[PDB]
Amino acid sequence: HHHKDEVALLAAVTLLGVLLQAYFSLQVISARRAFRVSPPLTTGPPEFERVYRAQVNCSEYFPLFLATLWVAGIFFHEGAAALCGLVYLFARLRYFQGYARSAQLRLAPLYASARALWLLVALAALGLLAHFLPAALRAALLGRLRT
Amino acid sequence: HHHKDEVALLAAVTLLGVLLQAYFSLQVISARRAFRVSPPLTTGPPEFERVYRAQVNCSEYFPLFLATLWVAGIFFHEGAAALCGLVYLFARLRYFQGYARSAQLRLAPLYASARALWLLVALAALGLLAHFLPAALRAALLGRLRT
Amino acid sequence: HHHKDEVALLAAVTLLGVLLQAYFSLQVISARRAFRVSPPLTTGPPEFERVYRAQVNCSEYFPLFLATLWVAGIFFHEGAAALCGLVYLFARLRYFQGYARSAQLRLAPLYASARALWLLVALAALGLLAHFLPAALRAALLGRLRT
Ligand SMILES: N[C@H](CCC(=O)N[C@@H](CSC[C@H](O)CCc1ccccc1)C(=O)/N=C\C(=O)O)C(=O)O
Ligand SMILES: N[C@H](CCC(=O)N[C@@H](CSC[C@H](O)CCc1ccccc1)C(=O)/N=C\C(=O)O)C(=O)O
Ligand SMILES: N[C@H](CCC(=O)N[C@@H](CSC[C@H](O)CCc1ccccc1)C(=O)/N=C\C(=O)O)C(=O)O
Ligand code: NI
């Protein structure tokens, strides 16, 4: 008996996220050509540094997204976690698109991505609490008994 | 019944990757000493910034590698995924070695690493498709029936 | 039968790590306000670049921590891995706090975090070795037999 069925949506969202990250990377390389910035060195016109920074930030947050997605999806509910992941990834795509154009336009999609990530965190926290809190509470009651 | 046996190669490749990352970090610190760059601050002679950038880029890609490795290894085939992972990690080591010497010498091993990563992605995609596409197709046919 | 029970501590430590990372990010944003640095652009007074760099470095190491934690926890022992993870995360929090104040004060907690990470690596290595080495040794003996 395989557990592929229990995690296939998490794996699919994860893969979509990877693909999206690849997209961000290629867009940064395209900004390296457009605005004549050769490796190493990550300075140039404002628009390049903005595109670059959007990609860097997405990259920095991508493992946080994965960790919470998987923990939430396993401990709370797979579908909810996957949905939140989709909302997050769409929000991040919009973030990247915004940032590339103007610092201010990254902001609205940025906020959407953060809410989804905290929602993933809260589900993770609730799921873990549901797992640990009953056994812990019971053990404390047993000692209290005793009398 | 443990599932260690089904994922031991993925875990081994993962650990090798971690070790390799540790190696990149220590090489960067060594460049910080050689070329007199004290923390914080990541600017100095060209050779330091190149070594530094090789490490940074490897670090940025390392979670993408892990995600696709695991998804491909679970959904498609463990051995193939591990092999691709080994090729990728070797390619990245060569990338780092190249970059440290000259921007242009990172390029050949860079290309090898990218092909292996996309190969991992394609296996992940195929594996997930194999999981989801039949059930989805059947459900669509059932509605078509109906008549 | 679920395997949540076998990985719940790893998941909890992982989530704590995510929360800690969120904390580092918010502290960096607070340094962006205090020392008047607007996005993109990551240069300003020394204290901002130090806080920023502490966060960046923690972020760079966070997936390495996760990978080894999970591999060690599954292949060697869950509790040991979780404990090492807790020590690591506390060490990193202290690292961030130190760095924010002075480059030199990040150093003591930095060393604590590295020992814990290498301890995780060693457990991962030992666990994987325990899994692979017997079967490999037996296979070699069988060929030796033969005679
Ligand atoms: N800081 C920017 C970041 C952009 C980037 O990292 N682009 C990739 C290359 S993009 C080629 C393909 O998109 C490969 C990425 C990929 C991602 C997920 C799955 C498969 C492939 C890259 O240059 N990697 C290493 C290096 O800088 O030498 C830069 O300097 O290039
Ligand atoms: N940007 C470069 C990056 C190199 C780096 O990150 N080196 C490590 C230290 S290298 C020591 C050992 O190699 C620990 C790393 C390790 C990795 C995987 C498993 C076990 C240990 C480090 O300095 N970490 C935090 C900090 O900058 O304060 C730098 O400024 O140091
Ligand atoms: N280089 C620093 C890094 C700090 C940082 O990344 N802060 C977060 C925002 S902090 C808001 C919440 O803390 C969300 C983070 C979070 C982490 C884990 C779980 C849930 C939420 C951020 O700015 N992200 C994207 C962007 O720069 O546009 C900077 O320029 O902001
Ligand atoms: Ni099972």
Report on the architecture of this protein.
The structure is a homotrimer of 147-residue chains. Chain A has 147 residues and is mainly alpha-helical. Chain A has a single domain (1-147), classed as Up-down Bundle (Four Helix Bundle (Hemerythrin (Met), subunit A)). In chain A, 83% of the residues lie in helices and 0% in strands. Chain A is built from four helices and no strands. Chains A and B meet through helix 1 and helix 2 of A and helix 2 and helix 4 of B. Bound molecules: ligand 1JP (3 copies) and nickel (II) ion. One copy of the ligand N[C@H](CCC(=O)N[C@@H](CSC[C@H](O)CCc1ccccc1)C(=O)/N=C\C(=O)O)C(=O)O sits between chains A (18, 21-22, 25-26, 28-29, 39, 55) and B (57, 64, 106, 110, 114, 117-118, 121). Chains A, B, C: This is Leukotriene C4 synthase.
In short:
Chain A is mostly helical. The first copy, chain A, has four helices and no strands.
CATH fold-level name of chain A: Four Helix Bundle (Hemerythrin (Met), subunit A)
- The share of residues in helices of chain A is over 70%
For the record, the count of structural domains of chain A works out to 1
Separation of the first and last Cα atoms of chain A: 47 Å
Described by its quaternary structure, the protein is homotrimer
Q: From the helix content, strand content and strand pairing of chain A, which structural class follows? A: mainly alpha
Protein chain pair with the most extensive contact, residues per chain: A-B, 23 and 21 residues
**What does the largest sheet of chain A look like?**
none
Alpha-carbon Rg of chain A, integer: 20 Å
Strand content of chain A: under 5%
CATH homologous superfamily of chain A - what is it? Membrane associated eicosanoid/glutathione metabolism-like domain
Ligands, deduplicated? the ligand N[C@H](CCC(=O)N[C@@H](CSC[C@H](O)CCc1ccccc1)C(=O)/N=C\C(=O)O)C(=O)O, nickel (II) ion
Counting DSSP E segments of at least 2 residues, the number of strands of chain A comes to 0
Shape of chain A: elongated
Order of helices and strands of chain A: HHHH
Tally of contiguous helical segments of chain A: 4
Corresponding CATH architecture of chain A = Up-down Bundle
Binding site for glutathione (chains A, B, C): 32, 53-57, 60-61, 95-99
GO molecular function (chains A, B, C): enzyme activator activity; glutathione peroxidase activity; glutathione transferase activity; identical protein binding; leukotriene-C4 synthase activity; lipid binding
Transmembrane segments (chains A, B, C): 9-29, 51-71, 76-96, 107-126
EC number (chains A, B, C): 4.4.1.20, 2.5.1.-
